[PDB]
Amino acid sequence: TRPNHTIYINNLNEKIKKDELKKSLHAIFSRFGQILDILVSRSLKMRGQAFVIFKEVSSATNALRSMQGFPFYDKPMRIQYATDSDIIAK
RNA sequence: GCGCGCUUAAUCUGCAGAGCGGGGGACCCAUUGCACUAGGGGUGAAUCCUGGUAGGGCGAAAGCCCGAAUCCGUCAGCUAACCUCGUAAGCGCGC
Ligand SMILES: Nc1ncnc2c1ncn2[C@@H]1O[C@@H]2COP(=O)(O)O[C@H]3[C@@H](O)[C@H](n4cnc5c(N)ncnc54)O[C@@H]3COP(=O)(O)O[C@H]2[C@H]1O
Numbered sequence: 001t002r003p004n005h006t007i008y009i010n011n012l013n014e015k016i017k018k019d020e021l022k023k024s025l026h027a028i029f030s031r032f033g034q035i036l037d038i039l040v041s042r043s044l045k046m047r048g049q050a051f052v053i054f055k056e057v058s059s060a061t062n063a064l065r066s067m068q069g070f071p072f073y074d075k076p077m078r079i080q081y082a083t084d085s086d087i088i089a090k
Numbered sequence: 091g092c093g094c095g096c097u098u099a100a101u102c103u104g105c106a107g108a109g110c111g112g113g114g115g116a117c118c119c120a121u122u123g124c125a126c127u128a129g130g131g132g133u134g135a136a137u138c139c140u141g142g143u144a145g146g147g148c149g150a151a152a153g154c155c156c157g158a159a160u161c162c163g164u165c166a167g168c169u170a171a172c173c174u175c176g177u178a179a180g181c182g183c184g185c
Pocket residue numbers: 095096097135146147148155156180181182
């Protein structure tokens with residue numbers, strides 16, 4: 001719940017492949033600001049989740065506030081704030 | 091060495107078939123998971139608590155024992171089709 005450069009999204013449709021999911025997430029979130037990276041994994045623990053890392057925290061906050069609850073692949077996205085991502089911390 | 095047996099998927103036929111087993115792997119169902127570095131998982135009865143113990147083997151029974159080892163490599167839920175490998179080894183009696 002603490003503001004971060006990286007936003008954490010879950011409740012995502014697990015049938016959607018990594019490439020397509022990342023492409024769609026970039027498509028939707030790039031309008032809020034420059035995206036540093038998008039981490040997606042389909043492992044047992046990490047599936048249904050994604051990490052969108054923004055260049056600016058303001059972008060992260062606006063994206064989160066704006067896309068909170070968005071119908072994405074027939075499921076409402078659940079968005080919270082990320083610890084800092086390795087790319088940012090470094 | 092051979093004849094019965096025993097744990098085990100570990101046995102038969104002339105490296106390969108048959109038989110017996112292990113793992114991956116859709117739809118369906120279940121899973122809401124804070125990652126970018128031991129974690130997660132598989133064979134087996136062999137797991138846990140600080141000698142006990144879950145769980146297993148022989149035995150009609152009472153009783154006697156095991157309660158090991160090791161591997162995949164950061165990854166594996168269920169799962170037809172399908173893809174794959176294993177068929178090592180350790181003993182008890184007799185001649
Ligand atoms: N899969 C398993 N799960 C749990 N526990 C297991 C197990 N396999 C074996 N055990 C236990 O550990 C001991 C190991 O015996 P092993 O098979 O080396 O050696 C055995 C066996 O090779 C042989 N044996 C046992 N019963 C036999 C029988 N009825 N006929 C012929 N030979 C027998 O003589 C030895 C006597 O063993 P014993 O039964 O006193 O003790 C056995 C058994 O109690």
